[PDB]
Amino acid sequence: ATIYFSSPLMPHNKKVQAVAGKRSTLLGVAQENGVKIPFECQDGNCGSCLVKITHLDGERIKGMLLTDKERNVLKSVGKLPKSEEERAAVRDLPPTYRLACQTIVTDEDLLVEFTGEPGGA
Amino acid sequence: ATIYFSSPLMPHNKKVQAVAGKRSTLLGVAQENGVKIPFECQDGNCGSCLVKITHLDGERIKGMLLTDKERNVLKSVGKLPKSEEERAAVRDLPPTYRLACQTIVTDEDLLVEFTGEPGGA
Amino acid sequence: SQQVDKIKASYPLFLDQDYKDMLAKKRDGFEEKYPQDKIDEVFQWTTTKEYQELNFQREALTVNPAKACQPLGAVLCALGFEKTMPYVHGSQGCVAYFRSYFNRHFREPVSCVSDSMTEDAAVFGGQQNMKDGLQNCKATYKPDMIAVSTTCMAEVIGDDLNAFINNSKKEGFIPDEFPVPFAHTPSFVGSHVTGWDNMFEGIARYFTLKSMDDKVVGSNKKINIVPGFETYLGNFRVIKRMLSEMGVGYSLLSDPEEVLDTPADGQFRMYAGGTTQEEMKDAPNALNTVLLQPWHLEKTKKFVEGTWKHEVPKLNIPMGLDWTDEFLMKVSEISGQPIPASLTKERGRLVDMMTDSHTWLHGKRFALWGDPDFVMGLVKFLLELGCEPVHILCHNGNKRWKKAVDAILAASPYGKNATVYIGKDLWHLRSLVFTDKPDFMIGNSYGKFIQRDTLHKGKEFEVPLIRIGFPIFDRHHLHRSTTLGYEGAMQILTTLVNSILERLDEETRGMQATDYNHDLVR
Amino acid sequence: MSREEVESLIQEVLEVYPEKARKDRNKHLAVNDPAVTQSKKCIISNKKSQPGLMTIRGCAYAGSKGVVWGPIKDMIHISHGPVGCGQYSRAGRRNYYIGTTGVNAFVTMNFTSDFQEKDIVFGGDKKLAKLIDEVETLFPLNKGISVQSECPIGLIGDDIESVSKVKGAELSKTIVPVRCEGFRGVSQSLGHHIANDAVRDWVLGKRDEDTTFASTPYDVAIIGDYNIGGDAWSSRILLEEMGLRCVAQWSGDGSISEIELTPKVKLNLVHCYRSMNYISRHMEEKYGIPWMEYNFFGPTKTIESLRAIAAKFDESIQKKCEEVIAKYKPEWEAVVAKYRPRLEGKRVMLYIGGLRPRHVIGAYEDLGMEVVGTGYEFAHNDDYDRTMKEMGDSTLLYDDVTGYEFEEFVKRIKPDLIGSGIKEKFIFQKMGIPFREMHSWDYSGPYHGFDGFAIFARDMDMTLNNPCWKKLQAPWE
Numbered sequence A, B: 001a002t003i004y005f006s007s008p009l010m011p012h013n014k015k016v017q018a019v020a021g022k023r024s025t026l027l028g029v030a031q032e033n034g035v036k037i038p039f040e041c042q043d044g045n046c047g048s049c050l051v052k053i054t055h056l057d058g059e060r061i062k063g064m065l066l067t068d069k070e071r072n073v074l075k076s077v078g079k080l081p082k083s084e085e086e087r088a089a090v091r092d093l094p095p096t097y098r099l100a101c102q103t104i105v106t107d108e109d110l111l112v113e114f115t116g117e118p119g120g121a
Numbered sequence C: 001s002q003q004v005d006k007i008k009a010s011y012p013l014f015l016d017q018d019y020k021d022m023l024a025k026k027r028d029g030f031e032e033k034y035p036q037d038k039i040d041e042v043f044q045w046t047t048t049k050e051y052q053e054l055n056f057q058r059e060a061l062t063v064n065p066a067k068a069c070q071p072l073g074a075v076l077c078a079l080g081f082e083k084t085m086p087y088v089h090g091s092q093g094c095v096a097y098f099r100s101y102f103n104r105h106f107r108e109p110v111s112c113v114s115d116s117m118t119e120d121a122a123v124f125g126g127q128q129n130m131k132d133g134l135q136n137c138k139a140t141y142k143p144d145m146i147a148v149s150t151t152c153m154a155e156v157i158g159d160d161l162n163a164f165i166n167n168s169k170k171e172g173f174i175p176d177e178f179p180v181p182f183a184h185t186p187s188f189v190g191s192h193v194t195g196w197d198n199m200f201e202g203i204a205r206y207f208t209l210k211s212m213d214d215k216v217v218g219s220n221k222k223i224n225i226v227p228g229f230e231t232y233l234g235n236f237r238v239i240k241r242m243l244s245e246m247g248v249g250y251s252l253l254s255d256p257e258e259v260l261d262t263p264a265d266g267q268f269r270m271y272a273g274g275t276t277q278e279e280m281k282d283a284p285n286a287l288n289t290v291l292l293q294p295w296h297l298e299k300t301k302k303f304v305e306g307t308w309k310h311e312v313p314k315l316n317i318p319m320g321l322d323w324t325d326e327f328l329m330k331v332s333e334i335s336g337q338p339i340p341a342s343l344t345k346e347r348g349r350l351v352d353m354m355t356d357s358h359t360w361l362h363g364k365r366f367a368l369w370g371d372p373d374f375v376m377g378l379v380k381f382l383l384e385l386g387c388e389p390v391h392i393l394c395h396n397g398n399k400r401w402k403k404a405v406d407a408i409l410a411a412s413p414y415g416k417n418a419t420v421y422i423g424k425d426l427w428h429l430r431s432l433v434f435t436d437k438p439d440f441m442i443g444n445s446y447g448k449f450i451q452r453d454t455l456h457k458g459k460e461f462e463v464p465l466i467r468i469g470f471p472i473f474d475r476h477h478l479h480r481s482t483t484l485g486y487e488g489a490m491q492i493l494t495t496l497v498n499s500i501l502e503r504l505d506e507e508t509r510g511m512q513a514t515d516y517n518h519d520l521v522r
Numbered sequence D: 001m002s003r004e005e006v007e008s009l010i011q012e013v014l015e016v017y018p019e020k021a022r023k024d025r026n027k028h029l030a031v032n033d034p035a036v037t038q039s040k041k042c043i044i045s046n047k048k049s050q051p052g053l054m055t056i057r058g059c060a061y062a063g064s065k066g067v068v069w070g071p072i073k074d075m076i077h078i079s080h081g082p083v084g085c086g087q088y089s090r091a092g093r094r095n096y097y098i099g100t101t102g103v104n105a106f107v108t109m110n111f112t113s114d115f116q117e118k119d120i121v122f123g124g125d126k127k128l129a130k131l132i133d134e135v136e137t138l139f140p141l142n143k144g145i146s147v148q149s150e151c152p153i154g155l156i157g158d159d160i161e162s163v164s165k166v167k168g169a170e171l172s173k174t175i176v177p178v179r180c181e182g183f184r185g186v187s188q189s190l191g192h193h194i195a196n197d198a199v200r201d202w203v204l205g206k207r208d209e210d211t212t213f214a215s216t217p218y219d220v221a222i223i224g225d226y227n228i229g230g231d232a233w234s235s236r237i238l239l240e241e242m243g244l245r246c247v248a249q250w251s252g253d254g255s256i257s258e259i260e261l262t263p264k265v266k267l268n269l270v271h272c273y274r275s276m277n278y279i280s281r282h283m284e285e286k287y288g289i290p291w292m293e294y295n296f297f298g299p300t301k302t303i304e305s306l307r308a309i310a311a312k313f314d315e316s317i318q319k320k321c322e323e324v325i326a327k328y329k330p331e332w333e334a335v336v337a338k339y340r341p342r343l344e345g346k347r348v349m350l351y352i353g354g355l356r357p358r359h360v361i362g363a364y365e366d367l368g369m370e371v372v373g374t375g376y377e378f379a380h381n382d383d384y385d386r387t388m389k390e391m392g393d394s395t396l397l398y399d400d401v402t403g404y405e406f407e408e409f410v411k412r413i414k415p416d417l418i419g420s421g422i423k424e425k426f427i428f429q430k431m432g433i434p435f436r437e438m439h440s441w442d443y444s445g446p447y448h449g450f451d452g453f454a455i456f457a458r459d460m461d462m463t464l465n466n467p468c469w470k471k472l473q474a475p476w477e
């Protein structure tokens, strides 16, 4: 899997090769490769590691489980519209906004964008 | 080179393998792969094939020549801020907005985004 | 087409001409199947001695294993106790597979619960799953004890069961006096028999470790019996009937015979019988503890010797004549009760049965496989009958067990061509029976395909399968059989001799070709 | 029973649960209203399972290896991880096939890496390569390898995609890594999604640039029929007596070549929507192949589905469909005449995985049997949208039912017959209530088509009217 980290803080987007399905959840990848996503909790109930993930392959998007913890955190932050929640619940497709501490890397090309700010704003 | 075409019109982003430096100028690639960027001229003075190109590799951005025709068209459309024009003129770095019929593909990973609309709006 | 008076199921409906034509068209047009000559060449190649040499050089590939994971045995051991709910801390597919396996083997309801851990539990641990599962399990099914095992997810993650349960009791999810024994049962270490040992050791720890000060060895004048991973209700019943006839006071720890066999009388009983918690608390007060299957109860032996101070006698599994005699003599020595006449007569009847059927069993070559204790007991009994166990296999075996089995074989002329294998699967056994053909096979239901492989080569190369072991899926109610003691020896002898006679009858039924040997009296 | 009695029963059952579990389980139970089209107003689905409540769901590994990838016969399916997952799912599913097992077919064989503790600590990416080499050495006639991941694989961080790519480049063999860890999904449905994604990304597109296949306007493919007890076969003949040419079956009695030839057809007939809609939509989007859902349970549904499929084609196909219906009419009429009087008015409660709780309702209706309750294990809201138009008014609906909930519902309603899996068979057989395995057809079948309807009726009659259900009560009690 190829992950392209982009952010206003980063001078350039960073291309990273990652192993799919590891217990490290794309935070581990960011911390290994020096990408600084704000992670400020250890349970998963804050929104700091909020990122926007774009599937660059389009025809290679994998099915995933949107856990109730991540769904509730995204709804508390306000980055989970009703349509995307319904799509995740019914068709098992990931939403556009994810939490970088709970997102398991899949075997595809992804563009991860963050603002260096907590999830809420 | 890997080019990811993204657009609201397209149901999914399309990944395309392309040969760098061909006389076909990323329009040819789009027309070969079925991507529908609005091209409505044959000389290069309209803004229709305006796209936004993001270099996903960041540390692999290649130097390029911003021809006065493309620069004038971008300034007529209004997608060439003074800072990016100065950067292109001095440091030979490409701007964020390009014209898909005058953009020569380089050996890097690119994300090309269009709105299915002419350049001006 | 179907006829309303002669309805045909999948066999032999698909043998009709229309179905044959449809399948032939499918295969010819779209399957791109290899030519039948290539298939026949490859099949004959697999039966050669050259293929066996490549097969036995396998180091990373396992084909048709002959073992399961630890939590299966852990679940069985948990079911062994009274009002005990097996609770597997991990993903929920494991529990479904365990229940399906045990339902297909015993054809009786099996009750187990899970924490239904998921991707959030893989990242942040499964402590909340533990708390909620314990609370829900105690509230809904109302058990008197919850016995916690682990899958391979919880082990790889590194979930601390003791911490999770202690934090669950102090938080108020379950009362502090509610017994929740736990055990770590990694599925990548050992097999299903090891999980039974780990679960029993954990339960014994939970019930006896903190109260050994006021325990005197011999207070209740009883003997503890630890059966182990046993999948025959008849073994549980015979191991209690023999002691009851003997007059010995006994306490069967982890007895699932009652829950795994309940009457069909209009009501469903989730719990039945089982060892009570009082028996587990009083276990250290017993005269001595006997492990029926000592080759997978090693950790339990360590705990019993170190903590309970009981000097566990070194006995073999009561399979056969000599080992049953040794077990009875050791029990008589420990309890002081003389062996009654009702067991000497049974031994004499078994010897009479052996003498009557020795002319058919002598010289027969058998290939066997299964659990270490069961396999070694079966090998000893076969040696007592004059049979030749040419191929001996035990996927979940160690080198000390192999050495013991070799020592047993060397102490008998018939254990001359025998070869013991450990770490080998059923594909190795298929290769072995093709090149060194035995007369029969003794194993679980997974050995039927091997027989089908031997028939394809030819009727003269077919190796019939005798189903003794676990699991048995293609036969009904064989789990009620017995393999321990004299009664089990009688049943095994009957099965072996009747399988031999049935095969002989099948080979000599062709009229005017081989039916001259179709003797009425055989 | 009316809507008032059923809701009282639902509340009484839920009274024993803890308050959080009670609130969660109240959403998954409902009383059917056929006028409701949006099931989300009534029933929630595809949610996690409440811990410790003894659910009946499975894992993503069961959904992928057990259900989708397993029936493929010409491939070899490695179970990467410990022994248990592969051992328990071996030959437990009656997906029939034709081949020489161990030579060119490998459905009922268990290939596993058999992880030890040294592989959990030091990884298993070299063991996988050595295993692939040994598989190529010992089974030369295999047409592909699929590595199904078990639970430890994702947790220890093993890169199997790289191994698959390297060994496929080396051996020129199709190696498909499936990340079907058991913890990745709440049930088997995500296993279906993962398996369909693997098929799409590693197998389906091999012959995109090949045009040597001779296509016809009558080419179709059977999707989501796994040939339980021969079911797919009983369907395939019914689709070839109408002149259509079934190019591929997914996946019962299927081969890796039919999967690759599937994009060369003119219509996809999807039997199980739940497990194969993911690939049906992908094929419609990419290759333009339309797809439609058909039901071959019972005579009525079979006739309706055949008429629809014929309507998808020209007039000759419709004439052949009418000929087939006329030919098979007396056969199922005789079965109905014989068995309906015996099975008239009986009440049934069903609980199956994701498709059959609504598909087999038509078969029970044709025998005069009323389904007084149905439910799924891992169905989504779509499935309940389709279900609400099938069930009668005031009939009970449940989702991911527990042992307690199902037992209490059965005790109050007292159905004449129950259809569910092996894990509930003996629970209700000790209660004196006839039970039919609706997963494996109770080792009988097939049940699809007109040939399977006779078997269906015979089995239902032999189980409901068996003389063994009158003897449970001892005469001296």
Ligand code: ICS
Residues within 6 Å of the ligand: D063, D067, D188, D226, D228, D272, D274, D275, D352, D353, D354, D355, D356, D357, D438, D439, D440
């Ligand atoms: S695949 Fe699915 S549980 Fe559609 S996982 Fe399950 S052989 Fe069921 S209701 Mo077993 S979605 Fe098939 C099923 Fe239905 S294994 Fe079979 S019977 S029609």
Ligand code: CLF
Residues within 6 Å of the ligand: C069, C070, C071, C091, C092, C093, C094, C095, C097, C150, C151, C152, C153, C187, D059, D060, D061, D062, D082, D083, D084, D085, D086, D088, D149, D150, D151, D152, D180, D181, D182, D183
């Ligand atoms: S949820 Fe599914 S079936 Fe479970 S382990 Fe995981 S992939 Fe497999 Fe496997 S060996 Fe035994 S049965 Fe389990 S504890 Fe591991």
Ligand code: FES
Residues within 6 Å of the ligand: A038, A039, A040, A041, A042, A043, A044, A045, A046, A047, A048, A049, A050, A073, A099, A100, A101, A102
């Ligand atoms: S860092 Fe708290 S939610 Fe990811």
Ligand code: FES
Residues within 6 Å of the ligand: B038, B039, B040, B041, B042, B044, B045, B046, B047, B048, B049, B050, B073, B099, B100, B101, B102
């Ligand atoms: S199309 Fe006119 S500018 Fe490119």
Ligand SMILES: [Ca+2]
Residues within 6 Å of the ligand: C106, C107, C108, D426
């Ligand atoms: Ca029973």
